[PDB]
Amino acid sequence: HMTPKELLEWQTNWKKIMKRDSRIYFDITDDVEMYKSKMDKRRDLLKRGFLTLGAQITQFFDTTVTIVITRRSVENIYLLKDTDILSRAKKNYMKVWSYEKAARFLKNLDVENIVCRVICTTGQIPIRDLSADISQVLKEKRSIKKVWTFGRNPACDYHLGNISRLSNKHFQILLGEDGNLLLNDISTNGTWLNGQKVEKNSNQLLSQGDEITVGVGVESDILSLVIFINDKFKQCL
């Protein structure tokens, strides 16, 4: 519920704090894991991301520390001994972040031609673009010029992720004559366009800001793409 302007202000402030006076400590204790070396790799990735922000990493636990980042469960810190630095950190009202939260934080601080710009507004997928060779496109005589496939399969032109009720080949975006994009559902569980379920194996014309929604029926697998069609493409086609 943060507006674009609010979230931008939120970001500006944190970058400011990170650069000037954040002091991050990485908890060296773990819960036994059944090869520590994998989380040592994800750890050093986090450290470099924070260094990218101009923040200072500490080798020892001070009270000058502003954030501690840990692999151990934050939920169970109250069960640790009083000497444990996670226990001491929380009781002194210090920030205690999970590796996931830290990676999530760093992501939020930014650490052929374009047919359209696909934007997943539910989060899961980064901003991707659809590409097509223009000279090759006008060369084609067939009615359908190019064909992007969306689906559960990471072999598709657009990977929708490993979702429960999706399909290896879920739906398609077809490029037609005269620079028009259209939509084609081939899934078995369904595709939606602006809240309306589209007819399977039937080409529906896409418009500006049209919202493709799949995985309807489970609020976790849900996925909404908004298509922002490039005007220059048709304006030169």
Numbering used by the authors: 103 to 136, 139, 141 to 216, 238 to 363
Sentences from the paper on this structure:
Rad53, and its mammalian ortholog the checkpoint kinase 2 (Chk2), are key effector kinases of the DNA replication checkpoint. Rad53 contains two forkhead-associated (FHA) domains, as well as two SQ/TQ cluster domains (SCD), flanking its kinase domain. The phosphoepitope-binding site recognizes an epitope present in DDK24, whereas one of the lateral surfaces of FHA1 interacts with the modified BRCT domain of Dbf416, herein referred to as HBRCT domain due to the presence of an additional α-helix at the N-terminus of the domain. We generated chimeras expressing the HBRCT (Dbf4) and FHA1 (Rad53) domains in tandem and solved the crystal structures of these chimeras in the absence and presence of a phosphorylated epitope derived from Cdc7.
Therefore, we anticipated that we could stabilize the interaction by producing the two domains as a single polypeptide chain. We fused the FHA1 domain of Rad53 at the C-terminus of the HBRCT domain of Dbf4 directly, or using a five-residue glycine/serine-rich linkers (Dbf4(0)Rad53 and Dbf4(5)Rad53; Fig. 1A). The chimera containing a five-residue linker readily yielded diffraction-quality crystals. The asymmetric unit contained four copies of the Dbf4(5)Rad53 chimera arranged to form four Dbf4:Rad53 complexes. The C-terminal end of Dbf4 (residues 216–220) and the N-terminal end of Rad53 (residues 22–29), as well as the five amino acid linker, were disordered in the structure. The distance between the last ordered residue of the HBRCT domain of Dbf4 and the first ordered residue in the closest FHA1 neighbors, the crystal packing contacts and the behavior in solution of the chimeras, confirms that the Dbf4:Rad53 complex forms inter-molecularly. Importantly, the four complexes in the asymmetric unit had identical interfaces, indicating that the linkers did not constrain complex formation. In good agreement with our previous results showing that the pThr-binding pocket of the FHA1 domain does not mediate the interaction with Dbf416, the complex forms through the lateral surface of the FHA1 domain defined by the β2-β1-β11-β10-β7-β8 strands and the concave surface of the HBRCT domain. On one side of the interface, the side chains of residues Arg35 (β1), Ile37 (β1), Val144 (β11) and Phe146 (β11) of Rad53 are cradled by the α0 helix of the HBRCT domain, specifically by residues Glu111, Trp112, Asn115 and Trp116, defining interface I. On the other side, the loop containing residues Tyr198 and Lys200 of Dbf4 wraps around the β7/β8 loop of the FHA1 domain enabling the interaction between the amine group of Lys200 and Asn112 (β7) in Rad53 defining interface II. Globally the two interfaces bury a mere 10% of the total accessible surface area of the FHA1 (755 out of 6,664 Å2) and the HBRCT (801 out of 7,799 Å2) domains, a value that is below the cutoff for specific interactions as judged using the PISA server.
